[PDB]
Amino acid sequence: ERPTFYRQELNKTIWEVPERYQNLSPVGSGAYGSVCAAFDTKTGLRVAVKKLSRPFQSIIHAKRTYRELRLLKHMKHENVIGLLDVFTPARSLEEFNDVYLVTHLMGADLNNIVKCQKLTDDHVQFLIYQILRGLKYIHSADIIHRDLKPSNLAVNEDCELKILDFGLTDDEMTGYVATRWYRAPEIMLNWMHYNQTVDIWSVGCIMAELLTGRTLFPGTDHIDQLKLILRLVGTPGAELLKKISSESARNYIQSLTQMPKMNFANVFIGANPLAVDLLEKMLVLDSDKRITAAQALAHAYFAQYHDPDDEPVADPYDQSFESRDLLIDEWKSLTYDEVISFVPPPL
């Protein structure tokens, strides 16, 4: 049965939501949507409700909407954001125009943690362990995050962590900006077809920052950031160079004065030697040679937390739609089907 909906205006946006959701309060806004904290009187949960902005305005938007809903419907893991509810006030496909996504409400992110709290090695162990546990799951579904950074990691009072994407442009990657500091170099400079290993670079950057309290590669721009990276990990060898399929990027990087990999024990002074070893295995320029999430979970750094019987993989995820070309109304109808077939988390 369809719940009763009620309307309010929230910062010149109409919100039409089921009665069960009360105390809506704006908490984040951007081009692709806006978010309210709410109270789900049905479950007694504090929730976030995201109203997608212009979900079907173009083929690109419509496909992105379908993409996010498919992803959130699939993700069922303790360290990965999941979907409590999805709804539309529309009574039919014909009048369908708005999509609302409901999740648990997150409190602090890892930026807040790193900026305000000081982290012991045990804290770093636990936090990184949970990122990798979540990544193992996400990667098993052949989902790449591509934008892992402290602001996309939510951490509760008990130091329990969830991976999400709060993403709501070339300009946005420009300059001295945290939007670029955690990106794998192959994606930052469009070196080649990239894959899930990009996320492991990001984890290396986050981990280093938990250990030092400071950004690892706070580049003032793409080139300055590359120079910071190469100063630490060394300039690429011939083997990696032949893998850089962009002939332009390859020729640029070859123009740089060769530099050796630095001693990581002298960069991360006082750090657990096992953390040093792990960082060396994550922060490898050749993405083919980076440690994977599944491999990293078995690294001795995580001995206290690693449980091979409680590090689950995802159910098969069909993303054949990614290579499909459809019209707006066809993406819209697929998205509609997914809204009406949603089944909330049990108990």
Ligand SMILES: Cc1ccc(C(=O)Nc2cccc(N3CCOCC3)c2)cc1-c1ccc2c(C3CCNCC3)noc2c1
């Ligand atoms: C409501 C909502 C819906 C969807 C998403 C959301 O994370 N969507 C999304 C989109 C694309 C990719 C992924 N991935 C995550 C897992 O890794 C693979 C890729 C996830 C996120 C939220 C969301 C947004 C804001 C908040 C907040 C606020 C954050 C800002 N301050 C107050 C709380 N709490 O909880 C929230 C959930």
